[PDB]
Amino acid sequence: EHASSDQGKTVSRATTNSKTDANTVGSYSHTTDNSTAVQDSNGESWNTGLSINKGESAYINANVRYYNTGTAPMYKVTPTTNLVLDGETLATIKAQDNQIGNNLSPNETYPKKGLSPLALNTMDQSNARLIPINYDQLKKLDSGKQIKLETTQVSGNYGTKNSQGQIITEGNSWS
Amino acid sequence: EHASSDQGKTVSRATTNSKTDANTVGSYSHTTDNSTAVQDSNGESWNTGLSINKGESAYINANVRYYNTGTAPMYKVTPTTNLVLDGETLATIKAQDNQIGNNLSPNETYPKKGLSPLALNTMDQSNARLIPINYDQLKKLDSGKQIKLETTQVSGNYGTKNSQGQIITEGNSWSNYISQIDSVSASIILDTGSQTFERRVAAKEQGNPEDKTPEITIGEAIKKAFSATKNGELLYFNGIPIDESCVELIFDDNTSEIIKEQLKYLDDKKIYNVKLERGMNILIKVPSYFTNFDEYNNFPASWSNIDTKNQDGLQSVANKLSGETKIIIPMSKLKPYKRYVFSGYSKDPSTSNSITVNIKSKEQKTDYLVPEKDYTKFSYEFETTGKDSSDIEITLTSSGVIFLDNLSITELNST
Which residues take part in binding Ca(2+) 3 (chain B) (predicted)? Predict the structure, then answer.
């Protein structure tokens, strides 16, 4: 939401020169009057505003950790996850460069045990576009309602030895 | 935040021509009046405003440096880091073109020693999108709260020679070997106080009859892993002795239980004589202040009542503690807000004498120890507070004749 605040000040001066001519008939009388007024004014103002876009009301950041309970490690772990709120899927995100785990041995996690979780922050390929929710979804979050994460699939590689002694994990897709 | 300022000015002129007609009946009278007014007005205004987006209130720039404490260089060093503020991860950034280190030799940094740190500035692939924080996070930063950085992983390459004489480092990913090396090795870390060195030494799999990895002791593994020099019994790093008795050995729960388990069935029980095993996590801490009564001594002061005219020491000679020994440790020479441990070797052939161990610190703590017939290690911890505080005093009083050797002060983790 865009929050703004403004502060104003004003000074002014008005000079009035009024000339009036009056005649009365009943006996006859003539009246002439000349007036001069000087007015000085000061003022100040305060404004506060806030605006919101109802289609992109908020951005969400999910802190996540990957687990491996199988028998083989996975290289270049690339999960795809659903973010679900109150019976609708807000987003489905495939991990990009920032969220890819290089190594995930069995019975281990990424990030490892003593480290804090990742930030699933973006939805686009270049890790530049944040994950939006609309106003209705934001209102739901401002209540008991919680976003659940489900992992729909995980991409990753296995290792083989090439003609030399090198281990390759590049075209070796687990899927 | 968008800050604006405006300045205005106004002039105006109003002319009024008023004609009024009035009649009074009571006698009858008629009144006619004509008026003309000219008004001139001047005015000026000043406006200042500021606006903020509450979702992208601020951008953060982290100045970072990469370190290599291993045995091999890394090419195209590409770390991934978490930025954590008050129990939430603001961002996880993988280094892009601007933040990639071409070369990172062992025991070196990128950027190198004399240069200023990098700028971890952007979060997207093209190095074009700045790292945002929201209003709540910004408010937290406008307080004691600090962002911490954690490195979750590092990508990089190794070099090989191709069919020609050329070195290639392009498809040679280190992450293809990290899992494998960690699975067949024991971890050994040497901490000299200022520098750290991390090693992986291959060890045989316990149950496998087809595993033909040679078996070596912990002492042999340490010598191999750090290229230490063996002066008979003495094992020397660059200049520091890294013998079992001259350092502090820290293990995790699993390693400690294995060493203890394997010690009983061993003659001349020494930790360095235990066979290295997979999954061990040995950590060697060089003491901040260590004195073996011989030639090596780096205590800030001199211990009182030293008797070097002996030959019943741990290595060559020992300090015959018959009375009281005291040293003075100025707080300037010692790191504040650090938890230390006092260690040494005590032997009591008489098996009757008792030692009073008094440590002067932020809190006064004294304990009594009875030395055994043979040399044994004792460990006593203490805490410190404030750079400019009371000096540290250590006193050792013995009932009778006591042999002391290899007294050390080692800094443990923070408080």
Answer: 292, 294, 315-317, 405
For residue A40, give every residue at least 6 positions away whose Cβ sits within 8 Å of its Cβ, in sequence order, or none: A11, A12, A13
Give B35's contacts in chain A (Cβ within 8 Å). 18-21
Compare all CA atoms of chain A with the CA of B90 and give the residue at the minimum distance: A119
Q: What is the spatial distance between Cα A132 and Cα A56, in angstroms, rounded to a whole number?
A: 5
Q: Are B294 and B319 in contact (CB under 8 A)?
A: no
Chain B residue with minimal CA distance to A35?
A: B37
Whether A58 and A91 have beta carbons less than 8 Å apart is answered as no
The verdict on a CB contact (< 8 Å) between B150 and A115 is yes
Return phi, psi of residue B264, to 5°. -65, -40
Q: Judge contact between A68 and A105, C-beta under 8 A.
A: yes
The size of the A-B interface in CB pairs under 8 A is: 186
For B190, the token pair is 């040497």
Number of C-alpha atoms within 13 angstroms, CB side, residue B186? 29
- Give the burial class of B356: count Cβ atoms within 10 A of its Cβ; 0-12 exposed, 13-18 middle, 19 or more buried: middle
User: Reduced to 3 states, what is the DSSP secondary structure of residue B97?
Assistant: helix
Which conformational region is residue A25 in: left (phi greater than 0), alpha (psi within -120 to 50 degrees), or beta?
Answer: beta
SS3 content of chain B, % helix, strand, coil (to 5): 10, 50, 40
∠ at Cα A168 (A162, A173), nearest 5°?
A: 115
DSSP B220: H
Are the C-beta atoms of B272 and B221 separated by less than 8 Å?
no
Contact (Cβ atoms closer than 8 angstroms) between residue B126 and residue B86:
no
**Structural element, H or E, at residue B142:** none
Q: To what resolution in angstroms was this structure determined?
A: 2.4
Neighbours of A66 (CB within 10 A): 22
In angstroms, the CA B301 to CA B239 distance is 21
Residue B198: exposure state from Cβ atoms within 10 A (0-12, 13-18, ≥19): middle
Backbone angles phi, psi at B173, to 5 degrees: -80, 125
Binding site members of B for Ca(2+): 292, 294, 315-317, 405
The technique is: cryo-EM
Q: CA-to-CA distance for A127 and B302, rounded, in angstroms? A: 61
Round to whole Å and give the CA distance between B409 and B193.
12
Residue B39 CB burial class (10 angstroms; 0-12, 13-18, ≥19): middle
DSSP string, B330-358: -TTSS-TTEEEEEEEEEE-TTS---EEEE
Alpha helices in B236-302 (DSSP H): 253-263
Q: Using CA atoms, how far apart are residues A26 and B30, in angstroms rounded to an integer? A: 6
